[PDB]
Amino acid sequence: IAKIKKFSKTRSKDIFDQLAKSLAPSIHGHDYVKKAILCLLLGGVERDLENGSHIRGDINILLIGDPSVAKSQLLRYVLCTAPRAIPTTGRGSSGVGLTAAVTTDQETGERRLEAGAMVLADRGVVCIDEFDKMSDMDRTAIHEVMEQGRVTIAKAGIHARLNARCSVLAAANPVYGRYDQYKTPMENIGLQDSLLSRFDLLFIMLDQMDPEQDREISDHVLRMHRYRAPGEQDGDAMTQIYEKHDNLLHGTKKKKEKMVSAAFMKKYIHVAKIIKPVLTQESATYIAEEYSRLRSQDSMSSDTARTSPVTARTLETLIRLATAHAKARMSKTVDLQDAEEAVELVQYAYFKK
């Protein structure tokens, strides 16, 4: 408790930068993806009104890119770190697996409800690899969960409603196998407008073979490969806030900075998720003006194209990302930079040249 408070007070604005930086040392680059994963771990705020209407507080992110850009590694890492993480591949689980079903018990003759994949994963993370291979029917089934976080089931003799408030990670490959630079993102993604709109963030990853980028990636992979766990004999077959520095894991250049330990990061994430932020009036007008600029950017798009349509859900996405960023640092109110970070994320994700 004391260590968490000391780290929060000393590192005031550096919490969100450091947690994203120290999210996955084994994976190089993709700072925006790490920030989005951190926002998912922090989560939004679920609001219930007097009339009983429910507003979703979860975020949906879809990752599309070329093969071998360390996407499955991120999914596996999130599965390991998340408390309630369930992996469901594209064709591994159908609508029956994802959505709870009704089975008639022969012993008593009554009908009982058996929970589906999403029903069990309440307030958790669901990772879906090869989402492009998934059929449209499963997408429509997942649409209800992504919209209202609930599943309605009605079979003669019984009817009930189950909660499905969950966040989803999806990784998919382009229709052509490799992302086409010349062709528009709409053709490469090959998904319906409703599915993209229900998704909150879209990330496109490119395997740019720059000499420096290739050299850095190769050096990082080679350093990780040559690393061996201490205390183990060579050739044998088989909590501090800052992690102990290693000559191979970190490097001589990275001696100036240290990475956060996994256990302390998990405890801080849990404490932050407990925290309930409150939106301020100053940020509301700024967010509204930026949303109006985003909607009016159609005449200012220049030669850049849009990956996803901008709808009313984007404003809710902006508010939810601001709430997650406010959860990143222990506070009570929403500041200007809190919304600016979300706006920068939206600018990076939505527009591509």
Binding site: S53, T140, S194, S197, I287, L315
Partner: protein
Amino acid sequence: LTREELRQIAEEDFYEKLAASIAPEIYGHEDVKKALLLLLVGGVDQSPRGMKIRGNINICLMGDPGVAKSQLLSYIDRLAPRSQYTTGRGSALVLADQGVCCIDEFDKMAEADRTAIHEVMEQQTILNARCSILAAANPAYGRYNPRRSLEQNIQLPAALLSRFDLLWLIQDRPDRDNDLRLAQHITYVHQHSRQPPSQFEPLDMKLMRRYIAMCREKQPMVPES
């Protein structure tokens, strides 16, 4: 009702207040609100000279996704006394007899069920299916194209659309001032957990339900003039 409550409904411009009282959280769209109010009231049923005529009002609302159709459907499901809310894949008609059947993703359903829907629309029978059908549809491409014909943009037969007595199109037309007004109203709704302050506070759900119940009890006669 208590007649004092009916008087509390019967102030000046009572029609406008009743129309705005239905889903006040969504700004504008007063015409759709009036259509839903008339659907709640409904017409008269007569059987003159051997044939039966319908008084049920069936309305089909189609628009681009994100125009708050699902929230309207949920609100009308809550407000209607006998209401059945169902989806395309998820499906009820008999259960909503003498009520309102709210169905969404109508464009996302197989034509086999659509064929049986025609008999329900035409004769209110299946068993009796005397219900008001409120269907929601979306454009095929996710955006309504005025260049394409209405039937192609709805991918439904012309007869089915004709059987719907009212069609309302809502397009997400980008207007700067309208966008700012919608954004500020949405921010007020989020922060205050309440509707923005309008001219008149909307009536309670129970009061509106009772008023609709009483107005349904009367059978006006059409004058020959």
